[PDB]
């Protein structure tokens, strides 16, 4: 078939010393477009030509405002006589997320305000490289097999070189997989699975917490690199055992909840004789299983009424679309 996609974008001001100075900047701009394979104040214009396939990106964004997704975007000088720009795009809840790199044949007029090669209204350009994840943030269950999506397209002429896969989380960052041009170099038992979409999805099996955090599928090609990141959250729902203890004087009701990562714990108590929620909850120090889940005990003290009550120790946690319960009863 054949179509055009457009997006409100920003773009960064060329003064490089300042960029080297600090981490970011806030300098405005305007919009970007391209021809596609479907199947008062003024804004700048970028016109880039599709050589290669942009994977699942086209449909994804054709119905993106309709499906109601907020679509960040931002173009940049891959720098600090032709010239080359790079963009980034984020679909939020939907999740597609992508880096595009572009070139201009230059000899032939330029815009005084910004140093951009312009032509019959616009910045004429063409895109020769992409890197997308469809999986921007991922929640897997402990020990399951995670496949972290990463594609990329190369424009014929580009020879791939590496496919590094790094983990950065908390304090540290470590390599995971390193695909050189012809051989693999896994460091954590990960398998990776004529000018068109490729696949670099890393696959992770038997996740253990050390596998949690931020992954950077990094596609170093012949001229330029383009990273894409994938957030791997790991969930371990707890299990919850209410029982009483401590010899019928000081009737200490007590709730063991454990085998759960991450650290957030919500513990709601219920007492009845259909009465509801109650208070006086009290927790215990923070111990952890060997694998790195957590345990704690809410030691609400039991008050029987005159014949008996039911205390319903429940928690909610990240993985639970529902609070896990434990019901026991109690006497005079």
């Amino acid at each position: 078939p054949g179509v055009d996609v457009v997006l409100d974008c920003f773009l960064v001001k060329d003064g490089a010393h300042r960029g080297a100075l600090a981490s970011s900047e806030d300098r405005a701009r305007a919009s970007l477009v391209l021809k596609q394979v479907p199947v008062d104040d003024p804004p700048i214009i970028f016109e880039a030509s599709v050589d290669l396939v942009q994977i699942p990106q086209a449909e994804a964004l054709l119905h993106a405002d309709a499906s109601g997704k907020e679509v960040t975007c931002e173009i940049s000088r891959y720098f600090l006589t032709a010239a080359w720009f790079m963009a980034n795009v984020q679909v939020s809840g939907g999740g597609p997320s992508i880096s595009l790199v572009m070139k201009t044949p230059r000899v032939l007029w330029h815009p005084t305000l910004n140093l951009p090669l312009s032509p019959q209204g616009t910045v004429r350009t063409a895109v020769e490289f992409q890197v997308m994840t469809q999986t921007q943030s991922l929640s897997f269950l402990l020990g399951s097999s995670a496949s972290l999506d990463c594609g990329f397209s190369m424009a014929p002429g580009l020879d791939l070189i590496s496919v590094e896969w790094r983990l950065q989380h908390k304090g540290r960052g470590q390599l995971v997989y390193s695909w050189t041009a012809g051989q693999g170099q896994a460091v954590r038992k990960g398998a990776t699975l004529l000018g068109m979409a490729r696949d670099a999805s890393l696959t992770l099996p038997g996740l253990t917490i050390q596998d949690e955090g931020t992954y950077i599928c990094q596609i170093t090609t012949s001229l330029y690199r383009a990273q894409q990141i994938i957030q791997l959250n790991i969930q371990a729902s707890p299990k919850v055992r209410l029982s009483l203890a401590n010899e019928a004087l000081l009737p200490t009701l007590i709730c063991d909840i454990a085998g759960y990562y991450p650290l957030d714990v919500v513990v709601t108590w219920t007492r009845e004789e259909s009465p509801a929620q109650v208070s006086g909850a009290s927790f215990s120090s923070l111990r952890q299983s060997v694998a790195g889940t957590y345990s704690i005990s809410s030691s609400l003290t039991a008050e029987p009424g005159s014949a008996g009550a039911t205390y319903t120790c429940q928690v909610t946690h990240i993985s639970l679309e529902e609070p896990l319960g434990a019901s026991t009863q109690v006497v005079p």
């Binding site: 304090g171 540290r172 650290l263 909850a281 009290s282 927790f283 215990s284 120090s285 923070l286």
Partner: protein, 99 residues
């Protein structure tokens, strides 16, 4: 992004009634740093808390330490109370003698 404090309540020396040793509340690995921490004896704020030093570890999480002169008694119920942006209500963690 935000991270809940990991909270341990313990005795410096092993708990024996009489003589001396201190009570420590170790509040670790939380983010952001705005926080409220009290020691409680039977639900009452412990007026003398000798040290509330603030430091921060390698995983970008702040950790502090709330402790004071201590002699353990059966009648009382020492505890540590924490309020934090991640905690919709203050969190109370009871001290165990051998834990």
């Amino acid at each position: 992004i935000q991270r809940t404090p990991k909270i341990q309540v313990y005795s410096r020396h092993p708990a024996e009634n009489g003589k001396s040793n201190f009570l420590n509340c170790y509040v670790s690995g939380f983010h952001p740093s705005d926080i409220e921490v009290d020691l409680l004896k039977n639900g009452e704020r412990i007026e003398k808390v000798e040290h509330s030093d603030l430091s921060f570890s390698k995983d970008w999480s702040f950790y502090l330490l709330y402790y004071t002169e201590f002699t353990p008694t059966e009648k009382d119920e020492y505890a540590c109370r924490v309020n934090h942006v991640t905690l919709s209500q203050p969190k109370i963690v009871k001290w165990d003698r051998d834990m």
